[model samples]
Target: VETFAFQAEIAQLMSLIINTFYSNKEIFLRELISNSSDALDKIRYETLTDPSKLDSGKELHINLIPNKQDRTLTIVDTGIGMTKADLINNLGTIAKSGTKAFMEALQAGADISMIGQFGVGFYSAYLVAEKVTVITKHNDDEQYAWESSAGGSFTVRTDTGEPMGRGTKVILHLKEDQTEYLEERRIKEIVKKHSQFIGYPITLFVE
Candidate 1:
């Protein structure tokens, strides 16, 4: 297991997103599950060019398990996993383009959707959770677990237990300020709203 620091800009953007966007914490779950669907699309799109890209025993679905007993929410998906590089880059410094570059790209009508998903989507998990845990296994590489509170500094290492196959699971320890999400109705509404467009199936554990 190896650990490293995310680039400076990567850390900076993470802080910015967590502080500003988490004002509406409910949206974090919606955004994360949507991200899961897109990872499946990444693999599906690759199959268009390479048949080998087809993943085996892979079902693209999401699991929203709320543990009222522990005050935690576990969001799991059987989608694409990340690598060492993916961790630092995906979690670390986004495009690293300066503000001038961002404005120039936007002024030229750059892709809004890509910008949103690229840097902004990954760290959105920090909004509602006191801390977020990411356990990921790459089909081509080893399994890894990483975590942070969206503050600064994170821990990464070899994951223990049953191997995760070609996907990622995120465990969110909910914050005291946002306990309303513990209810099933709220969880369902957010899922149905943002995930309706998701190409894969989404399931939630509800009472």
Candidate 2:
């Protein structure tokens, strides 16, 4: 397993998000679904130029599994998965543009309207989850798992379980107080509110 420390700025950003930034914690679901939708779009576009990109034959869709027994919420997507480098750069560090300006704005006490602009929506998962495990398989890279608990560092390791075909699966181990996320009714309501217009189909599995 390869472990990496979260960037100082990212750590600070996650602290802010988990503590004070979003008044509505349910938006975490919206942010995550939006990300899945984006990933699906990326792979769909890629297939237009290179048909082999979709050779896996996995239908493009998103699956939300709320396992009340395990107290875990799993969001699976058949989309453009990430490489090890992508996981480290995207999740462990905020290497995108505009981050510098965003940090300066934060320092200046400027009110930011959205988290998506900073490309840190993924961290919002910390609002409701104690730990997040991401298992993804990119077309050119082997399957890997990235896990963190909003701690100072995260670990990326090879996944020895069944392959994911070609996509990403994010398992959020919900916090004890945040168990409402494990309710199918609540999940459906959140999806209806935020992702009703999403292009891909979103299926919720409940038991």
Candidate 3:
């Protein structure tokens, strides 16, 4: 396993998101599903002319599994998974084009949704989760799993489980204070509000 520390800039940014930026905690679902849509778009574009880049039977869709019993919300997608380098660059550092721009915009009271361009919106999981687990498989690299508590560090390692042809699964361990996300009614409302128009299908796995 490899461990990496979060940059001081991003740590400050996360604190802002988790503590003040969002008025409603449930928007975490919106931003996360939007990110997944972008991922699916990437894969579609990548394979548009060269379909062989992806494995067989790789249909593009987003699946959400909300488990009240397990106290976890899992979002799985068959999209463009990231390589180890992509994970480190996208998840570790603030190297994305929009980070500084978005930070400056945040101070000026810009919309929070713009943060998604910086690839920082994934951290929104901390809005309702104590921990987040990501299991992903990229066409260019083997499968790997990444985990973090949104503190100052994260862990990534090769996953020994069965392979995912091309996509990502984000499992959020909901915080004790925010269990409403596990309710199907609440989830349906949020989906209708934020993800209904997403290009791909967003499904809910009922328990």
The best candidate in terms of lDDT: 2
1-207: candidate 3 lDDT, tens digit per residue: 999888777876777777665666777888789878988999999888888866633699999999888899999999899888878777866555556667778778876665665567787788889999899888888888988987788899999877788899999999998988988899999999877899998889898
Q: What is the lDDT of residue 66 in candidate 2?
A: 89
* Model 1 CA deviation exceeding 4 Å by range: 1-3, 47-56, 93-95, 98-118
Summarize candidate 1's per-residue lDDT along 1-207 as a digit string, tens digits. 554565665566556555443245666787788778777787666667876655543466778889887788888887767875576567654445574465355446554333345445666676778888888876677878888775557778878867877778888888887777778888888877766667787778875
Using alpha carbons, what is the TM-score of model 1? 0.80
lDDT, residue 187, model 2:
94
The TM-scores of all predictions, comma-separated, are 0.80, 0.92, 0.90
Global fold similarity of model 2 (TM-score): 0.92
Instruction: Quantify all predictions' global Cα lDDT against the true fold.
Output: 0.70, 0.86, 0.83
What residue pairs are clashing in model 2? Answer: none
Q: How high is the lDDT of residue 37 in model 2? A: 95
Candidate of highest TM-score: 2
> How far out, in Å, is residue 188 in model 2?
0.8
lDDT of 2 by residue, 1-207 (tens): 888888887887777766665457888888888899999999999999999999975599999998888999999999999998889878876556676677677657654336765577887788899999999999989999999987688999989878999999999999999999988899999999888999999999988
By lDDT: ranked, best first: 2, 3, 1
What is the overall TM-score of model 3 with all chains considered together? 0.90
